[PDB]
């Protein structure tokens, strides 16, 4: 019972909530803002994203690999709030008024960093946050699942306030988020007490270097998954960047796609959370490769089925699919890698693939798409990618590591012993 009476948690669980609320604003209703407010084109919206990644690549490495040597000092994660402070002004006064104010290239860029206060940041947050509750102990797997209510809830009500007014919203971005978020930095915690008074006494560190990667580039198990991720991911994550202006049309007004598109993500959280608190064994029984393979066919169905969307309702089910696979793509991504590759390579794997590869591919495939959408329409563009996507999955069938090699009852045991 070191929670109801204890602080940090009862605190860093709020900051952790009041953050995602900012998400529930940004990441869902961005395209809408762009298209529906800045009447911005489909081959140009593309650029926005294409641009982002470059900084969700160009940052996660500088960030991520800093936060370590930061300690329990809040310095980084403080100058992240000094952004989510200036949300409104930026967005209304300099983002769109640079985008819309036609001069695009040059400005997208000059506004693709407050893109990091989410992608690079979010982890930089979560990460730093646990060390906060690795010290004043409790477990945060009960603290984050506190901050996962803010996005769910932040979604619905922003869909509503967006129609009421697409701008009141950019003001809860600052208040709703900044002030409180950073006011939750006055009760803050520090100074190392009955364990680890240096970065080596109790809590170690997980490093990566040159020659490991050179041994990874060596390993084939990589090249094949490195494919599955670059092929069937970068891909499907394009479909999702703009599968909103597609969703919207189908309905009566604008207060439809919107007021209700939000209504779905939201009603598609529980469905996601209640699936996962479950997914573990579901996976360690179903294997790993298959847990991705499953994750695969779905997202591919999703893409494909979208090139056929003739009904609004449809796109409403074509949606539920999404948060119906992220668990498997996520839980799968793990229980697999850590089952086919060396513990030492681990973290490395998550750069040689994620913070570096997909982010590159995804960067281009956003523009290939960007244009393409406006060449055969979402639908047609959709008939392309989706097919491409579902194409790699089939391959990957042969490309991925077996469910039981020569040492699974000898090389892997970590959750068992
Ligand atoms: Hg907010
Ligand atoms: Hg791709
Ligand atoms: Hg969650
Ligand atoms: Hg993942
Ligand atoms: Hg990177």
From Swiss-Prot:
Annotated consequence of substituting residue 358 to T: Loss of activity
Consequence the record notes for mutating residue 355 to Q: No change in transport activity
Transmembrane segments: 8-34, 42-70, 75-100, 105-129, 141-163, 167-186, 221-249, 254-278, 289-308, 312-334, 347-374, 378-398
Signal peptide bounds: none
Topology class, membrane: Multi-pass membrane protein
GO molecular function, one term: lactose:proton symporter activity
Protein keywords: Cell inner membrane, Cell membrane, Formylation, Membrane, Sugar transport, Symport, Transmembrane, Transmembrane helix, Transport
Site (Substrate binding): 126, 144
Modified residues (N-formylmethionine): 1
Catalytic reactions of this protein: lactose(in) + H(+)(in) = lactose(out) + H(+)(out); melibiose(in) + H(+)(in) = melibiose(out) + H(+)(out)
Residue ranges annotated as Cytoplasmic topological domain: 1-7, 71-74, 130-140, 187-220, 279-288, 335-346, 399-417
Cellular component terms (Gene Ontology): membrane; plasma membrane
Record GO biological process: carbohydrate transport; lactose transport
Activity regulation field: Inhibited by the proton ionophore carbonyl cyanide m-chlorophenylhydrazone (CCCP).
Superkingdom in the source lineage: Bacteria
Main location: membrane
Subunit structure as annotated in this protein's UniProt entry: Monomer.
Protein's name according to its UniProt entry: Lactose permease
Organism: Escherichia coli (strain K12)
Name of the coding gene: lacY
């Amino acid at each position: 019972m070191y929670y109801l009476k204890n602080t940090n948690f009862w605190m860093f669980g709020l900051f952790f909530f009041f953050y995602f609320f900012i998400m529930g604003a940004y990441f869902p209703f961005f395209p809408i803002w762009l298209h529906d407010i800045n009447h911005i084109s489909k081959s140009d919206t593309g650029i926005i994203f294409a641009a982002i990644s470059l900084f969700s690549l160009l940052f996660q490495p500088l960030f991520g690999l800093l936060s370590d040597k930061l300690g329990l000092r809040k310095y980084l994660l403080w100058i992240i709030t000094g952004m989510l402070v200036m949300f409104a002004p930026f967005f209304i006064f300099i983002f769109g008024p640079l985008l819309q104010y036609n001069i695009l290239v040059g400005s997208i860029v000059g506004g693709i960093y407050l893109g990091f206060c989410f992608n690079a940041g979010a982890p930089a947050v979560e990460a730093f946050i646990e060390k906060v509750s690795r010290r004043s102990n409790f477990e945060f797997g009960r603290a984050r699942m506190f901050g996962c209510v803010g996005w769910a809830l932040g979604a619905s009500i922003v869909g509503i306030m967006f129609t009421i007014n697409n701008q009141f919203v950019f003001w809860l971005g600052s208040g709703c988020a900044l002030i409180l978020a950073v006011l939750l930095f006055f009760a803050k915690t520090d100074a190392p007490s009955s364990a680890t008074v240096a970065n080596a006494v109790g809590a170690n560190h997980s490093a990566f270097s040159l020659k490991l990667a050179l041994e990874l580039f060596r390993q084939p198990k990589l090249w094949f998954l490195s494919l599955y991720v670059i092929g069937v991911s970068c891909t499907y994550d394009v479909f999702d960047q703009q599968f909103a202006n597609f969703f919207t049309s189908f309905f009566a007004t604008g207060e439809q796609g919107t007021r209700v598109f939000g209504y779905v993500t939201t009603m598609g959280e529980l469905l996601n959370a209640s699936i996962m608190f479950f997914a573990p064994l579901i996976i360690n029984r179903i294997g790993g490769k298959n847990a991705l393979l499953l994750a695969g066919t779905i997202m591919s169905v999703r893409i494909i089925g979208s090139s056929f969307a003739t009904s609004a309702l449809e796109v409403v089910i074509l949606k539920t699919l999404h948060m119906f696979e992220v668990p498997f793509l996520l839980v799968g991504c793990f229980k697999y890698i850590t089952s086919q590759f060396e513990v030492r390579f681990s973290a490395t794997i998550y750069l040689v693939c994620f913070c570096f590869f997909k982010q590159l591919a995804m960067i281009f495939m956003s523009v290939l798409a960007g244009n393409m959408y406006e060449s055969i329409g979402f639908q047609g563009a959709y008939l392309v990618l989706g097919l491409v996507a579902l194409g790699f999955t089939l391959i990957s069938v042969f490309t991925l590591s077996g469910p039981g090699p020569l040492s699974l009852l000898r090389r892997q045991v970590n959750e068992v012993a």
